[model samples]
Target: KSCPNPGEIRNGQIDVPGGILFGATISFSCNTGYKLFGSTSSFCLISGSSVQWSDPLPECREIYCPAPPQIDNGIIQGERDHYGYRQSVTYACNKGFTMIGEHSIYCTVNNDEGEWSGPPPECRG
Candidate 1:
C-alpha cells in the first residue's frame, strides 16, 4: 500500500528500516569513496497488482579515475594514488620520446562516470 518515496541519493544512504508498506525492505549504502550503482536492496512486493519497488533506487557513482592523463613527454608508469574502477596505467616515453598511443590504460565506469581506457600516450618526437 506504499512504496514511492525512494528519492535522495547523492552520496548514498537510505536504509528504510523496513517501513515502506507492502513487504517493506530497502537498503542502500555508499560513502566511503562512492561506488554503488543500483539494486542494493529493494522489495515492496506486488507489481501487477499494485505496489512496486522491487529494485530501482541506488547510485553513488565516484569510482575515481581522472588524474592520470598528463602526457607531454610521457611518464606515468605504474604510478598510483587514486584511479579506482578497473585501475590500470602504463606509459613510457622520455629518453628520446617516441610513443604513439595506447601504451596501456584502463579504469572504466561508464554511465556512472570515470572513464579512461584509451587516448593518453603520444609523445612522438
Candidate 2:
C-alpha cells in the first residue's frame, strides 16, 4: 500500500493487495484555531484486495488573532509564522492594571490539537 506524505493522512478507501481490514482509520489535528485541510482517514474495499488514500492533505494553519476585544488600555505584540500560526506575543496592561499570567503564547502541534501550555493572560486592577 502507498502511504501518504509524512503529515498527510489517508481519509478514503485505499486499494491494496490482499486487504486484511475492512476500514482502516487514522487521525490528524492542527494547531490552535487552525483548520484541517485534508484527508483524515482510509479504508479497505469490500473485495478485501485493495486500498486507496483520501483526498486533500493536512496542513497546520495559523490562528488569526483579531485585535483583542478589550485592548484599549493595553499594548500587545504578537508574532505569527509565514503561514500565520501564532508564534509568540508580549502583553502589558496600562499603568494601574497588572498582567494576570505569562505574557506569551505559541501554537503547538500534537495528537490532541494546538497545545496551549498555560492559562490565558488577563489584566486586573
Candidate 3:
C-alpha cells in the first residue's frame, strides 16, 4: 500500500523516494552549521487510514558560543555580545601596560564554553 511521505523538516533534508510505501525507510540530515538532535531516520508506519513516522522528526540546532569573558585591566578588541564557535578574540592592555598571557583566545566547544589559551592577561604597569 502507498504511504504518505514525511514532510519537510526544518533545516533538514529527507532522502526518500517520490512515492512512499509501507515499511519504506527515509534518512534525515541537517544542513551545514546545524546539528541534528533526534532520530536520524524514520519508517513509514501504518496508522489506521494513513501513515505516520515511526520516529519523531529530528531538530537542527545551530551551534553557538557564549560571549567572550571580560578581562581585567584590559579591553577585548572587536568585542561582540555574541560569538560563534571557532571565532577568536584579541586582548590588549591599556597603554604603558604589558600583557602577561596569550594575547588571543578562541571560542571553542568545551566545558565552561571556552577557556582562554591562557588566563586573562594581566596588565602589568
Query: Which candidate tops lDDT?
Result: 1
How are the candidates ranked when ordered by TM-score, highest leading? 3, 2, 1
Residue range 1-125, candidate 3, lDDT tens digits: 76665788887798896446888888888665456788988888898887776897888776666566676678999787766566788989988888987888876554324333444667788
Summarize candidate 1's per-residue lDDT along 1-125 as a digit string, tens digits.
88788777888888888688889898898765577887888888878768988878877877777887777887887697888777788889999889896778888877557788778878888
Relative to the true structure, candidate 2 reaches a TM of 0.38
lDDT of 2 by residue, 12-104 (tens): 222334333445444556535565555543443343244444444455454444333235466766434332245555667889998877776
| Candidate scoring better on lDDT of 1 and 2 | 1
Candidate 2: C-alpha lDDT: 0.49
Could you tell me the TM-score of candidate 3? 0.62
Candidate-wise lDDT, in order: 0.81, 0.49, 0.73
Enumerate residue pairs that collide in model 2.
Answer: 10-41, 11-41, 13-52, 14-51, 14-52, 15-50, 15-51, 15-52, 16-50, 16-51
lDDT value, candidate 3, whole model? 0.73
For residue 97, model 1's alpha carbon misses the true position, in angstroms, by 2.8
Worst 10 residues of 3 by lDDT: 110-119
Which residue pairs collide in model 1, if any? none
